[PDB]
Design a protein around this ligand. Structure first.
Ligand SMILES: O=C(c1c(Cc2ccccc2)n(-c2ccccc2)c2ccccc12)N1CCNCC1
Ligand SMILES: *[C@@H]1O[C@H](CO)[C@@H](O)[C@H](O)[C@H]1NC(C)=O
Length: 337
């Protein structure tokens, strides 16, 4: 068609980027992450037991208040690297950036405190392919494309560096195109290894001058739902050894004074080198030799068939404006602004 639709995103602490969607008639509004690492839409349900503290602290969908709701009831379990949710399938009208679509989604009735008591968002909108959809439910972007309204069969992500500042724009998703106000130079495209997953070949990971990791190639999942850049436990422990970082419970840390002294990290993608300086990957909350500063990179062991794989999350997207091209099964990067 002839239209472009944008979704304004809120940036919470450079870790969570989410926007609003409306579900039902009248619309029930939810804060959702737009996740290229998954293919299902879900929100917490009014049928969720209140013994789940996450269901007490999040917005719940009430099918009994929606006149456009259509029952299904098929049970589903959605397993992620950080945790699992369980519930059942429902159908209703979903509003995303002015676009209205009839969508099958999950009503979550089992929502663990860890990690969901840490989510500022309520649910998730899966931006991945039908191949990875649980219960083979048609993903939302596929349903939007069927309407024949969007200018291009593409969607783009802008994640802002600034979270603290008001009047800044936390981020932005453009359905059906890109926003040239948020990137500079030209897009550099990398073809997907295969359709069904937003995953590309990575030809090397350099720490400083030498290529210390991913010699002989490896995989890179471009994941909008991930806060950090992640690699396997084996890759990260080698990376962190090179940086001189100390392993804590879930993350890696450096003495704050040493943060600025850290080397550049380069990701070799489609013949181009994508470089992050220490300012890009260190949470520089102070300069004290008496304080510990977290790194926006951690270990995450993603199981087969998708993994073992690196994941390029918000840490990477903040520097590089990303276009997800469904028409040509490729990913484009440009310097964000
Ligand atoms: O499990 C996670 C991730 C989730 C929770 C989630 C689940 C589904 C969609 C979006 C966010 N979060 C997460 C973010 C904030 C609070 C609690 C969890 C991560 C933070 C860093 C790395 C990974 C994940 N992912 C796997 C699936 N793709 C996105 C990343
Ligand atoms: C739920 O919807 C799916 C469509 O994917 C269909 O296969 C199934 O029969 C539906 N179940 C009910 C109980 O309506």
């Amino acid at each position: 068609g002839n239209t472009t639709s944008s979704v304004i995103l809120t940036n919470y602490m450079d870790t969570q980027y989410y926007g609003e969607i409306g579900i039902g008639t009248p619309p029930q509004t939810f804060k959702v992450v737009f996740d290229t690492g998954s293919s299902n839409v879900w929100v917490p349900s009014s049928k969720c037991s209140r013994l789940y503290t996450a269901c007490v602290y999040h917005k719940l969908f009430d099918a009994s208040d929606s006149s456009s709701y259509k029952h299904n009831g098929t049970e589903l379990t959605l397993r992620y690297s950080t945790g699992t949710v369980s519930g059942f399938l429902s159908q209703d009208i979903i509003t995303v950036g002015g676009i209205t679509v009839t969508q099958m989604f999950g009503e979550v009735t089992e929502m663990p405190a860890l990690p969901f008591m840490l989510a500022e968002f309520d649910g998730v909108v899966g931006m991945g392919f039908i191949e990875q959809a649980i219960g083979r439910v048609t993903p939302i972007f596929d349903n939007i494309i069927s309407q024949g309204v969007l200018k291009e069969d593409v969607f783009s992500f802008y994640y802002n560096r600034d979270s603290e500042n008001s009047q800044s724009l936390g981020g932005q998703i453009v359905l059906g195109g890109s926003d040239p106000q948020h990137y500079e130079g030209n897009f550099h495209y990398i073809n997907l290894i295969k359709t069904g997953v937003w995953q590309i070949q990575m030809k090397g990971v350099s720490v400083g001058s030498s290529t210390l990791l991913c010699e002989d190639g490896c995989l890179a999942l471009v994941d909008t739902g991930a806060s950090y850049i992640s690699g396997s436990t084996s890759s990260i422990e080698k990376l962190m050894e090179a940086l001189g970082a100390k392993k804590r419970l879930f993350d890696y840390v450096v003495k704050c004074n040493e943060g600025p002294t850290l080397p550049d990290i380069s990701f070799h993608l489609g013949g181009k080198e994508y470089t992050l300086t220490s300012a890009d990957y260190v949470f520089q909350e102070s300069y004290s030799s008496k304080k510990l500063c977290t790194l926006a990179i951690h270990a995450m062991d993603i199981p087969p068939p998708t993994g073992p794989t690196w994941a390029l999350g918000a840490t990477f997207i903040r520097k590089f404006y990303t276009e997800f091209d469904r028409r040509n099964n490729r990913i484009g990067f440009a310097l964000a602004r």
